[PDB]
Amino acid sequence: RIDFILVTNEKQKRKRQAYESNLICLVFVKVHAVLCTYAEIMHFNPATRSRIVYFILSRVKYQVGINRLVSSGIYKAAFPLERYLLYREWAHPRSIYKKQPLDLIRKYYGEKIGIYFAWLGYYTQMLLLAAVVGVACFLYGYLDQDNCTWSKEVCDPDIGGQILMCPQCDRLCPFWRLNITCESSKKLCIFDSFGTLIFAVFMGVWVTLFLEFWKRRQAELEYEWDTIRVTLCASAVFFWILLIIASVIGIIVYRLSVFIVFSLTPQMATSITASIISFIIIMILNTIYEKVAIMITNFELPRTQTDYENSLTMKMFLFQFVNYYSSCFYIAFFKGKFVGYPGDPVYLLGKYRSEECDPGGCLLELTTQLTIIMGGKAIWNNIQEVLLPWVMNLIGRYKRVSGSEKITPRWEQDYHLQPMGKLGLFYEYLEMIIQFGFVTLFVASFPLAPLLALVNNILEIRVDAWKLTTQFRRMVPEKAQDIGAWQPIMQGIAILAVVTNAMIIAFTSDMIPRLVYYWSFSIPPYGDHTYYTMDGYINNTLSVFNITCRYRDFRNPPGHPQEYKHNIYYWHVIAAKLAFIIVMEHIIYSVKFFISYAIPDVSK
Amino acid sequence: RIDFILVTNEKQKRKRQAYESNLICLVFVKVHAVLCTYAEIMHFNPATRSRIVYFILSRVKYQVGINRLVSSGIYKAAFPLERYLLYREWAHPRSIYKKQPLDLIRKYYGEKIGIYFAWLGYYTQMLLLAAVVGVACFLYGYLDQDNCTWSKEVCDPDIGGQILMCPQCDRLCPFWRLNITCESSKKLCIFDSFGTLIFAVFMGVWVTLFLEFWKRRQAELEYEWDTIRVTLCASAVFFWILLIIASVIGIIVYRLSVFIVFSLTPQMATSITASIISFIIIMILNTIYEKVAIMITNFELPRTQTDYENSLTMKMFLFQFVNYYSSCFYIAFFKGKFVGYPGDPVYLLGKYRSEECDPGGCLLELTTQLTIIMGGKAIWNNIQEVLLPWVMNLIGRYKRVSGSEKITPRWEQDYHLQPMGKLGLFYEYLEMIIQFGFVTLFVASFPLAPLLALVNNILEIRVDAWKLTTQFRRMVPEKAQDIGAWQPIMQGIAILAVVTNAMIIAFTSDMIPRLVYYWSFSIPPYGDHTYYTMDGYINNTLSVFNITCRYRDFRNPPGHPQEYKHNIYYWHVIAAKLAFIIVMEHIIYSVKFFISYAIPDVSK
Ligand SMILES: [Ca+2]
Ligand SMILES: [Ca+2]
């Protein structure tokens, strides 16, 4: 029974006939394994039966491997050929919610694809406790939003009506009031109130437990399963940061476009629309960033893709890092900053002015860009994988695909299946490490981003199950362990996540400015109250600006001793911002030190 | 030739005679190795000749090892028996400065003691580049101290003479002027000026390079050489923090003693004297902390000392951490804080007041406590090791000790030598990890603390060479690698050092308050000058206090809007303190990420 099938005319022909000769123990050439004699050199099962015959295909070149032989063009394809159950209890409609038979991914696909499919299946249950603490925040961020006087002053037009602010832009830009920030700041109080600073502190607890409990999990998965130089790297990173700023400026021009033609408030309709339009070009500029990441690595020194696990990963992911997240690193740490003396922008070192944010925290503009990137990439990378097959279950496959595991010699049909690609699950880990660096990078806001990534991870655990089972020409059942190049990147994201979640709460969410006013401006030092009460916070926080209106900034009022230089309060909150950065990092980095000390990695 | 020598009466006698029987292939019993037959079970040289016969002594107990046999009392001692050169070119006066033959510590003592003696020898050259950048600071902290107007106002009695401060203590405590802080603040400007915030940033660069270049070094050393549970651990840490605060209060009462009987200013003579008196009791309370660390581990569960490498290390070092450093963690983060409304102390939750620091930064009280702890422990732990032998080279040893390597059967003389102790180089790594967590914990101040620890590490590299060669009964040449339990502790000190050096500069050194005044109070916002100049900083920084005098604090003057609550400036500097914590950690933790990425660990 079959294990692997292969498929200037006479000049390449003599290059081909000599390799098949010592392999011996259109028309497609069968193999079958002499089977034992290469099973002792490396340390039955049809998934293993394709392994050893690929190990046979590894050593013997020619006299004058299919690495350069298929890349030259002599061969057109070389490919291989339990499956019935993986369409029923693990694939689609006949049943879709049943626990994943991960040891029956060893049975078919091994651990190249299993260590993604248990890292996905662990991720989903680890997103389950992370989504109820999104629903918990959705409970007391919305249902508790009837008294909290953050999003009650802003929607009462008596506390939030007469608050006449300044324009942001220069021309065609109004003196816009408050009471136009209510439909955004009635749902803003579910994203920030108290159970996000519980939740992001929980997320920092979560991601540093998501790691370590997976570190115990993959150890259990390791248990149940087997076991000129500084000049060349310079001009690869140096053209890169020149192309980072293209991606940072990609959103902003498409921020310069849609905001003109426009003007369920239109402000939510626009922030959806620009995060659709920027989602178009980040879908486009993703294609270029794969092609300019290949041509920099082949212009880099020789190693087959096998070294691109260390080099294309650190370039193509890190392009995707810049392509996806450095737009969101704009709406978060660089958008809302740099207003000055006459509302002085930094003018962005050119002839135009720079742009500002709104007085609710600029987190809502993030949290919809966060939503419909990670929930648009969830759609678009699970609609692209039902459009490649150009149908969803055309043929019946009721008694036929049982037979395709029975015997059913069909390799003319398996030639029609698309090849897996030269890089395997590199493109599939990429769209999840992109998702994982969305659930943990910008999560203070939108705590249901686990739930959105939960029902995604009930489908993506099943749609990637389905296209591996039905659609793709079968990948070689390679045995790897420790998923590899992403685990320093996940920890590289997670240590960056403890910084950036804390920088989300401090520098792009006005909850520390709320925390402080509760504790240090409604006490009678600088305040007018008896005990702690959040009454009167929206007038009590911002800076007036004489016509020589308020703007989202902590600055001395004009007509005071040192005006448009900061306050005690810009100084206190930025000192409490920087303390919250300092405290919550030194606690989460201690709990990361404690929890990894509290439980050993190897299985109990 | 000899490899290892051993040495109710009849009741213990029958327990003894049966072990020697199958070992066969006062009066001291020789051994010599049947030598080959245990050299294949584990994977010539007299240093190895004592290894394999100790490996022979490992398996065969008795029928009814010297672990429990010498601990019971049947045996009185069991011990073992190239050496001429290690007294000449590596030991003392005949020659003392010659490069250490570290591979000739493999020749005699192996890698139990060699991996300390190359970790010391690397440490010394890595303290050499760290001491010139102490001399560089000693150049432009002293020789540049003629204009800097920090320590020129304080010694000019015209800028620092009329500055009439407040008392610190309550009774017998004066209204003390300035011009009594000049002899301390003429040498204060060598400890803090610019080339300490270069140097501590250099130290944070240094310790994160001291690690990684040793990580490359020990890899080269690995290359050239071989290859109820939560309830029991609770009440060990819970009685401990009750004994931490004894060590914190150990200094303060001996701060309450000497400061009464007293009152080259007497203030330098007192800070030497109390850091002599606290050095007495920390020498005393060290003895208790060894005895209460043993009796907690034998009251903990059974493992011979072999598990005490993981448990006595994490208790006895961590006692020494608390015994030595938590006095210096008092003079640094908890001494100079908590002054309040009528100069309100926190009263230390009792019937007495609390105590304050001086207006130069409280770093000088640290830097002499830092000096004469680490330079008194350098004396006392290298005078205790010339007093145990009760002489230094009594006998001639010119042609005799050459003969002790020639043959010279002398085991009656080697019985007189003191035993090495049950724990080996645990007490010798301890006094250096104590020194290493002095060079890197509290180093912003005293940049010659590498040079003090350099000439120490020319003697300690030689006095520990000498007592290993002449004095001690020879340790068993055990082969270990990665020095072990201290390498997570060194990295545990070093990641704590990046925090605490930055917390030295910010929270216990007024250089950030100098940095800020240079940049943000002598510009005309809040200032009265044309360009940046450090003129007028000592009046311009502190808080007046109506009789209702200045004190080292950033507070609103009485008779202002919200008095004795902080300023823009307490708010700016503490925001720039916390930023300097944030920036220099995120740069040093990035350079730690960059340098460990820049160079691979395994040898080139
Ligand atoms: Ca997929
Ligand atoms: Ca010593």
Curated annotation (Swiss-Prot), chains A, B:
Q: Where in the cell is it found?
A: Cell membrane
Q: What is this protein called?
A: Anoctamin-6
UniProt topological domain (Extracellular) ranges? 140-193, 335-363, 506-579
Q: Which reaction does it catalyse?
A: a 1,2-diacyl-sn-glycero-3-phospho-L-serine(in) = a 1,2-diacyl-sn-glycero-3-phospho-L-serine(out); a beta-D-galactosyl-(1<->1')-N-acylsphing-4-enine(out) = a beta-D-galactosyl-(1<->1')-N-acylsphing-4-enine(in); a 1,2-diacyl-sn-glycero-3-phosphocholine(in) = a 1,2-diacyl-sn-glycero-3-phosphocholine(out)
Disulphides: C148-C189, C155-C182, C166-C549, C169-C173, C357-C362
GO MF, one annotated term: identical protein binding
Summarizing the annotation, the consequence of altering Q384F is: No effect on lipid scramblase activity
Q: Which residues are recorded as binding Ca(2+)?
A: E385, E428, E431
